[PDB]
Ligand binder design. Structure first.
Ligand SMILES: CN1C(=O)[C@H](c2c(-c3ccc(Cl)cc3)[nH]c3c2c(=O)[nH]c(=O)n3C)c2ccccc21
Length: 337
């Protein structure tokens, strides 16, 4: 018992499989998006209530909360647009086109200091092994500054994360390569082949000596950020951590979701890691070299596959989100004991 579970609640306002659910930077709000393009904004403390609900005419692929104006949400389309939405005022502030050669805005990341964001923009799926770009923007003007070259070739980038100061950005791509960018020099500091297949999620460790990745080969790997492609540790997660996520129903009919949202999330200090499973969130203790890393807590509560997760700390309380293919989002409240 590294945690006491104080409760588990269900947010059930979505009627379709969940794509993304992220807690805002104040830790008091959720933005959630499903595969029908329904975006919902809601609070959960002390109870669940919906602040806003909109159906996007445009398909939506990505979503990211702003870091300093914490009421602002970025939404990335499948039609080569980034919209800026004010959740307090319930209206779009602007919508910007990139070029239409690459309509799929697969990832958004806001810099900690609030001055910039990055998005990835990818060509249409055929294999996701298609060209893509990585764009740097100015938040205040909502104008593109610059685009990072990708070696050896343009490639779809699935996942982005900044470090604590925002001087580093780590990315994972469809060609299985992680690229770490120096955001002051605006160059690739480091890159290495991380996975056989796509990279789905990436993150800096709390101490920022390592980065974590998870990819299509089912592996969770920790990399030495000081030496390119030197593994620190490596585990085969259960296959239901990385999908593909399937919901059948006897009919010959099934729904299939490939990873799109975050597949892992962490507690405030990066000692624990939440992952997906068929039946709910599964948490592992990080740090240590047990040959088989073992579950320390199973959050349970899902009757359909969990496809993305989040974890945030606020008022010294942990809140875990688990989202499944039936639309349901479980909110589990964790106290560090
Ligand atoms: C009304 N409005 C905003 O609040 C917003 C804005 C931002 C901002 C944009 C995106 C993200 Cl992810 C975070 C922050 N930063 C801003 C402003 C702003 O208006 N004025 C400023 O001085 N700063 C520093 C913005 C852009 C474009 C048109 C309207 C707005």
């Amino acid at each position: 018992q590294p945690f006491i579970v104080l409760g588990q609640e269900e947010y059930g306002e979505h009627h379709s499989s969940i794509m993304h659910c992220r807690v805002d930077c104040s830790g008091r709000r959720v933005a959630s998006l499903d595969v029908d393009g329904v975006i919902k904004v809601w609070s959960f403390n002390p109870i669940m209530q919906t602040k806003a609900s909109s159906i996007s005419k445009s398909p939506l692929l990505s979503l990211e909360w702003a870091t300093k104006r914490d009421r602002l949400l970025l939404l990335g389309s499948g039609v080569g647009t980034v919209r800026l939405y004010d959740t307090e005022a319930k209206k779009n502030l602007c919508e910007i086109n990139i070029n239409d050669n690459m309509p799929r805005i697969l990832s958004l990341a806001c810099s900690p200091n609030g001055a910039s964001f990055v998005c990835s923009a990818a060509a249409p799926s055929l294999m996701n092994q298609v060209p893509g770009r990585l764009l740097l923007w100015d938040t205040k003007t909502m104008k593109q500054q610059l685009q990072f070259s990708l070696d050896p070739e343009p490639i779809a980038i699935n996942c982005t994360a900044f470090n604590h100061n925002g001087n580093l950005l780590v990315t994972g791509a469809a060609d299985g390569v992680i690229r770490l960018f120096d955001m002051q020099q605006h160059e690739c500091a480091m890159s290495w082949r991380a996975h056989y297949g796509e990279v789905y999620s990436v993150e800096f460790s709390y101490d920022e000596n390592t980065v974590y990745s998870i990819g299509e080969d089912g592996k969770f790997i920790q990399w030495n950020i000081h030496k390119s492609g030197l593994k620190v540790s490596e585990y085969s997660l259960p296959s239901d951590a990385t999908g593909p996520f399937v919901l059948s129903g006897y009919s010959g009919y099934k729904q299939v979701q490939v990873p799109r949202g975050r597949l892992f999330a962490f507690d405030s200090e990066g000692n624990y890691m939440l992952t997906c499973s068929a039946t709910g969130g599964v948490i592992y203790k990080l740090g240590g070299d047990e040959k088989v890393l073992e579950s320390c807590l199973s959050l349970g509560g899902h009757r359909a596959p969990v496809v993305t997760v989040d974890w945030s700390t606020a008022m010294d309380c942990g809140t875990c989100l688990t989202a499944s293919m039936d639309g349901k989002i479980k909110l589990t409240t964790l106290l560090a004991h």
